[PDB]
Amino acid sequence: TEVFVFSVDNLKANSSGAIKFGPSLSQCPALSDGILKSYHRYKITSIRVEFKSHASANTAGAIFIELDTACKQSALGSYINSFTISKTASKTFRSEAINGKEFQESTIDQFWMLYKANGTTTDTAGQFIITMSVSLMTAK
Amino acid sequence: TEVFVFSVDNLKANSSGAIKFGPSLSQCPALSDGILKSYHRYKITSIRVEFKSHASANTAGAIFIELDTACKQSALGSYINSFTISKTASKTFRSEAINGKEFQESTIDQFWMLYKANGTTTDTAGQFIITMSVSLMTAK
Amino acid sequence: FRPTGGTEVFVFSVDNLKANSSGAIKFGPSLSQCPALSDGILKSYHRYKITSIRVEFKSHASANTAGAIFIELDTACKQSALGSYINSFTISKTASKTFRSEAINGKEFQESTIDQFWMLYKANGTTTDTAGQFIITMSVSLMTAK
Amino acid sequence: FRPTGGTEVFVFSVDNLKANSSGAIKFGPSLSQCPALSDGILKSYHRYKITSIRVEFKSHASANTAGAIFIELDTACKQSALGSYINSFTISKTASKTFRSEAINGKEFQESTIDQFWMLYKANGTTTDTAGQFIITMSVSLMTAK
Amino acid sequence: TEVFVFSVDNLKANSSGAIKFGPSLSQCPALSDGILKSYHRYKITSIRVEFKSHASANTAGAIFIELDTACKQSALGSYINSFTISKTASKTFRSEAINGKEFQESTIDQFWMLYKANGTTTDTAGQFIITMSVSLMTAK
Amino acid sequence: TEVFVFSVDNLKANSSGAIKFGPSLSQCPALSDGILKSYHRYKITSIRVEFKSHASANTAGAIFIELDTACKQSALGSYINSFTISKTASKTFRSEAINGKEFQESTIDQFWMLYKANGTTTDTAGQFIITMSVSLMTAK
């Protein structure tokens, strides 16, 4: 069981995307092109996503976070979880939320974290600092 | 975790069908068009199906129940579980039978409950009173 | 399942039994009502014997259906029509008949290619109304892996 | 075999294992080395899980054959070549490896149409001489009659 | 009831065959052209087959034993029972395994014992020393 | 602090080489292209090297092991530590032997493990199964 800290950078005020955890998690090559190449099964036990807000106080908007444990949803949809663009905050997601109770093979993803900024301008918003706890088993 | 009680009504003596639990479970809109719209992950922990038998004593036949956790079987096939049309009874199904050990997303079904009455006439048989226990996860 | 063989219990059902249904339930490799024995464990053993069977009539019928379905054991595996009328389930009642080893030719092993016995049944009813179903519980013993 | 399901133990063998043999033993409905599971009891149940397996290498080889056959679990049911070389039986020695439920994806039931895991093996030997055989002892649990 | 001890000789490292017990059991003429000519009914109660392993330690392989009480199987098929070519061992088979519960006429066989060596070379493997217990009935 | 198990494979009877622990430790990408990309400082606390001996009994020779905490020695030199090619064995090396008392940066190696088989033929000898215990510091 290890802990990885990585960052989603250059996050504008109209940035939308998906952070696809697993072997397609290119923002942390220590997991993607790293330790998942040396194990069969893994599970991500909990993640702690932090918005750091490198923005001016006049930028309006709130970036939205939504968990997709189907690994297929493209557009966001839900607007309950939100970081305000002008404030640092952090959201912590446990195992049953992120499909983290059972191991799965290192070839398939576990969940996606979709985000949508929903601001008007392309001004800078900040970055995510994501701290995930993975468990591994059956070396390869 | 909450408990829903719904009914499958107007059940004739030759009625066959599938009660598709999950988002396509139209017999309980409090789950289908309801609380599953406000959560990502769910599991149905146990169901208690009851046959109520609003039938005369001269109606012959026995309605058959079969669990499909593949969510694809159309015709019934198995004839072990059965309610007699002229008698009230109840069958209780736990978690490992109904694929209820793990959470899954609110977009996909969990299991189906197929039923086939296998009587001759179109006379009234009764109704199902189904009591399901669901557990909900990450909100949406 | 040890390779020398084992003893297990199968529960299967003969379904959709009308009030004029007649037939034979041919136990062994031609016992299509339990594929776990027919297309199943008999493909993985040479010799078998069915030690005892417990046939149950479940009677999914109305009280106005007259008749009585008759049961007859054929350990020759060749009789087509019924003939004997001693053993009977009433169509409107649940009952069960249990048959031990010497009745069903179940004392000795035989190869998994040949049947052991047949269970003939004949409804003896006028209408094609529903009668019920059989729930059959057989105890098999297996010998020599294949 | 209750219609709600049961737990049984199957013993089968992977035979004629040379000193350069590689392959995959695909557990589930495609597990042709045990027809009692493949064309057998999985035809009479919806859901199953293989709780634990005990693979044994029996080493019908001379003492001059060099090499070590390698074992690797694939619970994705898609890996073709071996890759990992940690688990190994020496070709000239009898041994056994036992794999529990969380290693072989054996915690949850799944439908009898899909496989559960594969066991890949690769001899890692020069010649085509005889190495031995696997004697595999798996414990399955069954759920929902079909 | 008497006991016969006979031998299957000159057993190479790729030898396969069937030892057909009964009147066609040519490896023991005391049963084949012997006491079965003087009785109608017989049964072989138990057999004890022994592999004696007149082989060098460098011969690889294992000869396989399989009982055929149908008296028709030609190729081997099963690989559970085995003698290692470089070791002496013995397997004992009781009555229900070898179809030895009931008498049968002296004109028909009772069972076959198939063996297949499954080694590469034609080097010497050993011999079988088989000890069978027969029971005889009505004289002839 | 985590434990890595990796293997040095395809080890012939005349194989010589160096297993260079640290960022150049290509036999375990979970350390090399893995967790060392996500931390500044590391130390390998102890290693347990095991020779597994996939060899025939007629292969002569003994593979030799020598620790180089200078990370510069090319040829072997010392012949005290040895695995016999025809036997499984294991050698365990603690912290002061492998330069494992102090942290160092993830860009530089810690020690090398040189091995030289010193047999005549190119026949198969076996493999190493190496179990190392690393400690990680400041994240990166």
Numbering used by the authors:
A (entry chain A), B (entry chain B), E (entry chain B), F (entry chain B): 61 to 200
C (entry chain C), D (entry chain C): 55 to 200
What is the paper's account of this structure, in its own sentences?
We therefore present high-resolution structures for VLPs of BYDV and PLRV at 3.0-Å and 3.4-Å resolution, respectively. BYDV and PLRV CPs assembled into monodisperse, homogeneous particles of the anticipated diameter. When imaged in ice, both BYDV and PLRV VLPs were monodisperse, so cryo-EM datasets were collected for each (see STAR Methods). Structure refinement was carried out with icosahedral symmetry imposed, yielding density maps at a resolution of 3.0 Å for BYDV and 3.4 Å for PLRV. Density maps for each structure were of sufficient quality and resolution to allow for unambiguous building of the shell (S) domain of the CP (BYDV: residues 61–200∗; PLRV: residues 68–208). In both cases the N-terminal R (RNA-binding) domain is not resolved in the cryo-EM density, except in the “C” conformer of BYDV, where an additional six residues of the R domain (residues 55–60) are visible. No density for such metal ions is seen in either BYDV or PLRV, and no putative metal binding sites were identified using bioinformatics. As for many viruses, both capsid structures are strongly positively charged on their inner surfaces, presumably to help facilitate packaging of the polyanionic RNA genome. The outer surface charge profile is similar in both BYDV and PLRV capsid structures, with an acidic patch at the center of each asymmetric trimer. Inspection of the interfaces between individual CP protomers, and between asymmetric units, in BYDV and PLRV suggest that both viruses have a similar volume of solvent hidden surface involved in supramolecular assembly. BYDV and PLRV have comparatively short insertions at the C-D, E-F, and G-H loops, where larger insertions are found in all other viruses with known structures, resulting in a much more compact fold.
The Luteoviridae are an important family of pathogenic viruses responsible for necrosis of the plant vasculature which, in turn, causes severe stunting and dwarfism, and ultimately crop loss. The structures for BYDV and PLRV each reveal a luteovirid capsid composed of 180 CP monomers. The CP monomers each contain a single canonical jellyroll fold, and are arranged with T = 3 icosahedral quasi-symmetry to give a particle with a diameter of ∼30 nm. The luteovirid capsids are formed from CP subunits with a canonical jellyroll fold comprising two opposing β sheets, each containing 4 antiparallel β strands (βB-βI).
